[PDB]
């Protein structure tokens, strides 16, 4: 193949499909930069991507402790496609072989870049000293505990890694020995505390030695049927692929999200792959809920954003009439609420494909 203008040359590690397994499975922690070397968001990644490296191996220095490497997409295609990259550059994390569900998509410094990986490559893991701290518990948010004999043990390395893992997604805390052992009459135990204090503890039942299951366990834990989206979370979610059916409410009213969640598990549950069920925050997102004319005392508002246009629910109380928001998707899906849509008139435009991955940082591949 015969160089173009834009050919390129960096110290950083070249993966192919020769190379990849390998580096990859030994690395703890992986960094890796798909790119392209005609995209010009890709040509300003590069210096950055390199210094940030520099910095981070000087902290890191052992072998396969962080792993900074790239891939040139246009002369990997089947790495690419196996990835299913769908822009450059793309910045994915890889535990152990494993991707991240999360890319790194803040900002293109060297400092923000290796605070990242910092952060990633901290113990998100809070050991507890006293059994009385369970029940001062934030049960705000979702919590694991794991109780272990010995943190030189199995069960607690396959404990260790899926925390690794899901640290972004819930809280790991570990308890150890004499700490440990009123909790361990059977033995090692998982427990899984959900948010609030109306709901039981559900424990675990498979084998702990067993990371495939264990993981499964803890990540069908962490993942609920209608993710709150954020700011944060905004462009992976926008990536699925799917219409978003959107529940806008105040925080403080969780009456109307749990109306919501219980009436999407009993009337949606045939659309799981075909629209995204989300709730939000809508002090926060009052511009979004500018585009169908709504305020924070409208909500709860239902809408959908097909991210071509936005629709609204009429009325939350609607919801709780047995066919109606089922209907509602339907008529997504139809072409109905486009056509009957009424101040000939267009829908409002979407504003949630403004958080998807923009031209602005991004070389977008074609679907």
Same mark, same amino acid.
């Given at each position: 193949? @015969? ?61 396969? $402790? ?28 890889? !535990? ?10 803040? $900002?293109?410094?060297? *400092?923000?870049?290796?605070d990242?990986i &910092? ?9 507890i ?27 607690? &390395?396959?404990?260790?890694?899926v ?16 700490v440990?052992?009123?909790? &361990? ?7 899984? *505390?959900?948010?609030?204090?109306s709901?039981?503890?559900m =424990? ?17 834990k962490?993942v609920?049927? @209608? ?39 009993? $009337? ?32 709860? =508002?239902?809408a ?7 629709? =609204? ?15 509602? =998707? ?8 486009? !056509? ?13 494909? *403004?958080?998807?991955p ?10």
């Amino acid at each position: 193949l @015969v160089p173009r203008g834009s050919h390129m040359a960096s110290e950083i590690t070249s993966l192919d499909t020769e190379n990849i397994d390998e580096i990859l499975n030994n690395a703890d922690v992986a960094l890796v930069n798909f790119y392209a070397d005609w995209c010009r968001f890709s040509q300003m990644l590069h210096p950055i991507f390199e210094e940030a490296s520099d910095v981070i191996k000087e902290e890191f220095p052992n072998e396969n $402790q962080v792993v900074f490497a790239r891939v040139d997409c246009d002369q990997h295609s089947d790495i690419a496609q196996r990835y299913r990259i769908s822009k450059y550059p793309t910045l994915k994390l890889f !535990r152990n072989g494993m991707m991240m569900k999360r890319e790194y998509r803040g $900002q293109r410094s060297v *400092k923000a870049l290796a605070d990242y990986i &910092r952060q990633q490559k901290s113990d998100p893991i809070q050991e507890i000293r006293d059994l009385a701290e369970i029940t001062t518990l934030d049960r705000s948010k979702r919590n694991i505990i794991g109780y272990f004999e010995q943190k030189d043990s199995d069960n607690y &390395r396959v404990f260790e890694r899926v925390a690794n893992i899901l640290h972004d997604d819930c809280a790991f805390l570990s308890a150890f020995g004499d700490v440990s052992k009123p909790e &361990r009459y059977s033995g090692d135990n998982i427990i899984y *505390k959900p948010p609030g204090h109306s709901a039981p503890d559900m =424990v675990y039942l498979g084998a702990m030695t067993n990371f495939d299951v264990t993981y499964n366990w803890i990540q069908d834990k962490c993942v609920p049927l @209608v993710r709150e989206i954020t700011f944060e979370n905004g462009e992976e979610l926008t990536e699925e692929g799917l219409p978003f059916l959107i529940l806008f409410h105040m925080k403080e009213d969780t009456e109307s999200l749990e109306i919501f969640q219980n009436e999407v598990a009993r $009337q949606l549950i045939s659309e799981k792959g075909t629209i995204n069920f989300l709730h939000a925050d809508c002090d926060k997102f009052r511009h979004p809920l500018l585009h169908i004319q709504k305020t924070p005392a409208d909500c709860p =508002v239902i809408a959908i954003d097909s991210f071509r246009h936005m629709y =609204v629910f009429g009325d939350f109380k609607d919801v709780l009439i047995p066919g109606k928001l089922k209907q509602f =998707v339907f008529d997504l899906h139809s072409g109905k609420l486009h !056509r009957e849509f009424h101040h000939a008139s267009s829908p409002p435009e979407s504003s949630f494909q *403004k958080l998807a991955p923009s031209e602005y940082r991004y070389t977008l591949l074609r679907d």
